[PDB]
């Protein structure tokens with residue numbers, strides 16, 4: 001059956017390379033298998049979610065060409081659906097009210113006597129998790145994982161006001177959206193057994209899970225905002241081209257023999273879960289810089305010119321001063337070859353737009369400065 005993957009970010013306000021890699025891989029797996037890639041926004045923690053955060057996710061995804069086939073589906077807009085499933089579960093006895101790990105004191109069982117519910121209390125609803133046996137899956141990354149159901153408990157699926165809880169919302173979404181493959185950070189591995197049990201109890205087919213190892217920073221710690229990570233659009237703002245960041249990130253957790261340089265289309269054609277790395281990958285800004293230099297040489301000069309404009313401003317060089325100065329498109333072609341970033345292009349090129357206080361072939365340089373400008377500057 002056709003593949004259906006998803007990217008289901010919680011919008012907490014900051015996205016680094018590690019985060020957007022968890023979009024890249026399910027996108028690539030869907031495109032490789034001619035399947036569907038779904039976008040879901042996990043906003044049920046209203047305290048730690050915002051519209052700004054959502055637009056930044058959409059902007060980073062678009063910058064990297066991670067187009068999605070369905071969505072964005074917002075969990076906070078699916079509360080009627082979640083409530084409907086909870087009512088069905090209660091009718092079928094798959095969830096029960098609790099009126100106080102949890103020890104199942106309020107779990108109904110044939111033969112067991114339950115107390116009368118305390119008159120003053122709105123119960124929480126809990127899922128009837130299996131008490132015997134084990135929950136196991138063949139993780140595409142981690143291999144066979146197996147957990148005793150005795151170690152799990154009867155998950156709260158709804159608060160006393162009836163609001164559904166996070167893990168339950170995930171399962172309903174994965175069911176409703178027909179998800180076949182769940183590729184996500186291994187920081188979610190512990191939620192997997194409880195999700196599997198609910199999904200199965202609801203009648204679904206359990207997807208294939210692939211839990212990605214952490215991404216490390218250059219200090220060998222987990223890449224994170226607190227550890228000084230740059231944001232995805234921070235890379236753009238520092239002069240990195242999207243095609244470079246895409247090629248770099250693809251290889252930060254996945255391999256295909258010796259290959260290091262490849263297009264998006266070739267990545268899609270090659271991508272496979274079997275060659276996801278099984279241990280953490282480590283960021284290396286020198287490697288990213290090499291690739292960015294490579295792609296800068298390859299980039300169209302008029303494109304580079306437009307990307308360069310905000311870096312010239314940062315150097316006290318103005319739109320008007322550029323139009324009046326040497327042709328920027330020609331300047332880009334002449335100066336880009338040594339640059340690791342678009343910012344460096346602009347810095348190396350500022351000499352064409354600054355009053356004189358390092359140069360390519362004298363003749364090309366003179367041609368781009370007008371006749372009038374070269375003539376006068378000599379005489380003095």
Ligand SMILES: N[C@@H](CCC(=O)O)C(=O)O
Nearest residue numbers: 008009010042170184185
């Ligand atoms: N919302 C989670 C992903 C959950 C999932 O993929 O099941 C995150 O942002 O890390």
Ligand SMILES: [Cl-]
Nearest residue numbers: 220221222223
């Ligand atoms: Cl760490």
Ligand code: NA
Nearest residue numbers: 323325326327
């Ligand atoms: Na000009």
